[PDB]
Amino acid sequence: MNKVHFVGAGPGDKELITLKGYKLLSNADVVIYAGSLVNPELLEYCKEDCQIHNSAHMDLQEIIDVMREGIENNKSVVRLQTGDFSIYGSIREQVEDLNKLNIDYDCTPGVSSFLGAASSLGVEYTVPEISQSVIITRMTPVPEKESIQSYAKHQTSMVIFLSVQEIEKVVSKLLEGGYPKDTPIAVIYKATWADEKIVKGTLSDIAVKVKENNINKTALIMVGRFLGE
Amino acid sequence: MNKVHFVGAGPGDKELITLKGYKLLSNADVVIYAGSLVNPELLEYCKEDCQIHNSAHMDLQEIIDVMREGIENNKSVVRLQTGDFSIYGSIREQVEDLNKLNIDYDCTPGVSSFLGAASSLGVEYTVPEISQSVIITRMTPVPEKESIQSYAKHQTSMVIFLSVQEIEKVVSKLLEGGYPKDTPIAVIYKATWADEKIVKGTLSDIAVKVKENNINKTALIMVGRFLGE
């Protein structure tokens, strides 16, 4: 067909889009991107006469109209979403709405920010005799068997998306599920963007280190012995 | 400098390498790739007069010699590793060995196969009111607090890398940690490669479905209610 193309933008760096992503983007007639969550530098890969829409200022129905009209005028349509949409992506709404209308689409994965964060930190989640797993979660209430404390019990590597002001709740949940105070932890803002910042520490001292970096906005926290390497 | 470039190849599809990855690869004088784990089609992006080495037939020290000699003749050196090396990547050996020699390097992340698997399945690990987390693990013995049964207790979404013949041990561990028999599950071989295959089912019937697909080799298993969407 001329499918609507859902494209993972990667974690911030211009060049961390997939080759496939880049081809579709650089050929798109209509692009719908996520506001300030997607790096604007990406948009420079688009055609001179491309029509850009910023979903951040749009309701669902407007995105869809924009999509449908792209299809009906035989225009290549790309919806750029941050990192990958299989982890915190809200792509279901748009898909169901397109089924409703009988519009073919496809999906092109991207590099998750937690992958970006690791490379950026030159670190490996899975490290022999230390951990063979990762738990990925994020921090208004949460069922017990899915809480940070509960996941902490495994003492494996963890990735936690948070709002940063909530640092003290999460540290205390980590200690509560039994991570020791010296457990290494890192907090990364805008992993792989030009402005990325990394605050390294342990469970006791990072609350302070985060406040004293003042750095606001959402972050990844990475927790575990795997930071010891 | 002229750093040794560690590059994530992505999950199999030629075009799912990052743009950055592609530039480095298409300019490399020396490439060291992982045997049959990396798709050979990628190698076609290399210069006519590029020197290819297949780590699969090499010990550590040979890789390093090959690296060092690239640097000393001012040759761009790319080590291509499958998916991303922060999850099951064994990049530590090569890095420590390069520190030893004082050789600058850098790291370029790629699309993990479990991301490839999701897009390929058009599915989302995190789905509102169903799960806000993912546990990523793999299946010769394993400590209790890090076993599949133990992780199963959270009833969240799981990704498990296995050898496929081991399907029955893992199903029984899943049920044991309390996933119900009707829990959807999928097994994917070579996610995003031309030959990828998807066996969809539930916990009771998938052991059979896998045997009767005969399909050998390593797979991803994906488990959870999140497959119900």
PDB file of C-alpha atoms in Angstrom, chain A residues 2 5 13 17 41 50 57-58 87 97 121 162 166 173 181 184 196 208 211 226:
ATOM      1  CA  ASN A   2       1.141   3.473   1.167  1.00  0.00           C
ATOM      2  CA  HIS A   5       4.776   4.417   9.033  1.00  0.00           C
ATOM      3  CA  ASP A  13      21.055  11.609  19.002  1.00  0.00           C
ATOM      4  CA  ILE A  17      17.760   6.686  14.200  1.00  0.00           C
ATOM      5  CA  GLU A  41      17.516  18.078  14.683  1.00  0.00           C
ATOM      6  CA  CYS A  50       7.343  18.343   3.946  1.00  0.00           C
ATOM      7  CA  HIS A  57      -0.398  20.355  20.362  1.00  0.00           C
ATOM      8  CA  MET A  58      -3.001  18.026  18.863  1.00  0.00           C
ATOM      9  CA  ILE A  87       8.262   0.421  26.011  1.00  0.00           C
ATOM     10  CA  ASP A  97      -8.257   4.258  15.286  1.00  0.00           C
ATOM     11  CA  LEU A 121      27.911   5.057  30.351  1.00  0.00           C
ATOM     12  CA  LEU A 162      11.185   8.732  36.973  1.00  0.00           C
ATOM     13  CA  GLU A 166      10.617  11.600  43.492  1.00  0.00           C
ATOM     14  CA  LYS A 173      12.062   1.610  48.154  1.00  0.00           C
ATOM     15  CA  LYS A 181      23.525   1.459  50.898  1.00  0.00           C
ATOM     16  CA  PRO A 184      26.043   1.839  42.873  1.00  0.00           C
ATOM     17  CA  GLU A 196      22.970  14.747  28.599  1.00  0.00           C
ATOM     18  CA  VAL A 208      21.882  14.769  47.824  1.00  0.00           C
ATOM     19  CA  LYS A 211      19.394  17.873  44.573  1.00  0.00           C
ATOM     20  CA  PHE A 226      26.647  -3.854  37.217  1.00  0.00           C
TER      21      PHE A 226
END
